[PDB]
Ligand binder design. Structure first.
Ligand SMILES: [Cl-]
Ligand SMILES: [Cl-]
Ligand SMILES: [Cl-]
Ligand SMILES: [Cl-]
Lengths: 45, 45, 45
């Protein structure tokens, strides 16, 4: 039962690192959409 | 104690599932705003 | 062994809280980026 607990934890940690990666990539794309909007803003103004 | 550990792990998994679901919604919204901005770019440039 | 399990759970929940905080921030920034887009649209059209 402790083995089963340990294996579930290791799976949880692994899925959590993939969420951290996904969030990191999201923030990079978001920073680029923000830069794109400010570019357009500069132009129409 | 193992009961308390098992309960904690099932809340963490539950919460991690809802994080994954919010991350998918964020990616779709992000995809929509990248497209909206591309629509502006083609019309403004 | 059970202490190491508990410790790891506490590490995982702490990271989860920080992830949730990142998701909420990213959602706000996204809402603002969408607003900025809809403003440019209304101005252009
Ligand atoms: Cl065991
Ligand atoms: Cl998580
Ligand atoms: Cl027990
Ligand atoms: Cl112990």
């Amino acid at each position: 039962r402790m083995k089963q607990i340990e294996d579930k934890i290791e799976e949880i940690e692994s899925k959590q690192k993939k969420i951290e990666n996904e969030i990191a990539r999201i923030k990079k794309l978001l920073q680029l959409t923000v830069w794109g909007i400010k570019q357009l803003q500069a132009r129409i103004l």
